[PDB]
């Protein structure tokens, strides 16, 4: 079963996730994410650094972006 959906404001920016296998958005812009066999997640802006959940990947992306808009992939 896929992770639960989420929606929160993290460091001033809206992050959302939902089962689709799973989609994440930063301020309404889709962020490419991927699930590893062991259940961890990465995103295209943190793609060598597994984190435990898609919300953690969205948060890691906000950290990475330092305020910058995400470009569509």
């Amino acid at each position: 079963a896929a992770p639960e959906s989420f929606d929160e404001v993290y460091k001033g920016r809206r992050i959302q996730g939902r089962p689709a296998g799973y989609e994440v958005f930063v301020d309404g812009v889709q962020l490419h994410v991927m699930r590893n066999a062991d259940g961890s997640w990465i995103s295209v802006v943190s793609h060598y650094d597994p984190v435990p959940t898609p919300r953690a990947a969205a948060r890691a992306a906000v950290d990475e972006l330092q305020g910058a808009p995400l470009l569509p992939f």
């Binding site: 490419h32 802006v45 793609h47």
Partner: protein
């Protein structure tokens, strides 16, 4: 045709490498390497087709990708070869690698922007065009997101693993390839990307010229592993869904197989490579 430790380059070799990389960028060729790599990063998955990463072909795929890049450099200046970065030895920000005459240093704290070296945004010579993070300047945070590069003792532990790879041939595997890649164990290759930070931590990691020097040393570790384990070879060897078997061809080239890339000496040698 000799790949040298970056720390040993002469001033003239550094100048010619930088100029050749900047000309590939100016002509638009460099960015298409960045784009190819990101496409494979985003498509290689543990339960589906996987070629460039998280799979046995991670090593021959990057060997051929680096050969493509080196050949492009040699079309600009035939004397240039890819150097390699031994991050187990040159492990601090004061390594000459990060000097203004080579790759430039770490990014400033406000926005990660690299402020010196030939690839600093201020030079006008290194626009970041293929991107996901919308910013257009090279960024790094050396040692920011993880605080140590692998040590030699860690590298040696990985080199001692005898099996090249094991089912399920993905990020969950035991074996040499996945411990070198870093998804399991003490973590060599993925940790180095995390350590550099900035674009090197993303699917558009070839935006940083250190990408090539990192992968040339990963590639050297594959060659060292072979010398330690003459009785071990690439697996799988036939009939494996979603994974490139030994004699199967690899995208995007379609005309080369892992079998064609196991012996690096067909293409280059190293300044030094231990014999078994």
């Amino acid at each position: 045709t000799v790949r040298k430790n970056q720390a040993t380059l002469t001033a003239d070799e550094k100048r010619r490498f930088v100029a050749a990389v900047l000309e590939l960028k100016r002509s638009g060729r460099y960015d298409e390497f960045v784009r190819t790599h990101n496409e494979f990063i985003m498509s290689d998955t543990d339960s589906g087709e996987r070629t460039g990463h998280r799979s046995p072909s991670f090593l021959p795929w990057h060997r051929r990708f680096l050969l493509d890049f080196e050949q492009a450099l040699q079309s600009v200046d035939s004397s240039v070869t890819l150097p390699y970065w031994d991050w187990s030895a040159d492990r601090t920000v004061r390594a000459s690698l990060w000097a203004p005459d080579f790759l430039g240093g770490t990014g400033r704290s406000t926005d990660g922007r690299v402020m010196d070296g030939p690839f600093a945004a201020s030079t006008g010579n290194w626009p970041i065009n293929v991107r996901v993070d919308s910013r257009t300047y090279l960024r790094r945070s050396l040692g920011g997101s993880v605080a140590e590069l692998p040590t030699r003792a860690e590298v040696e532990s990985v080199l001692a693993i005898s099996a090249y790879d094991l089912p399920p041939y993905n990020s969950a595997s035991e074996g040499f390839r996945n411990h070198l890649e870093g998804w399991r164990g003490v973590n060599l290759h993925n940790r180095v990307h995390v350590w550099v930070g900035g674009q090197m931590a993303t699917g558009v990691s070839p935006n940083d010229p250190v990408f090539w020097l990192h992968h040339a040393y990963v590639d050297k570790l594959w060659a060292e592993w072979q010398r330690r384990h003459p009785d071990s070879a690439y697996v799988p060897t036939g009939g494996t869904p979603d994974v490139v078997d030994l004699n199967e061809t690899m995208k995007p080239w379609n005309t080369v197989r892992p079998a064609d890339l196991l012996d690096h000496t067909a293409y280059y040698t190293f300044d030094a490579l231990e014999h078994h």
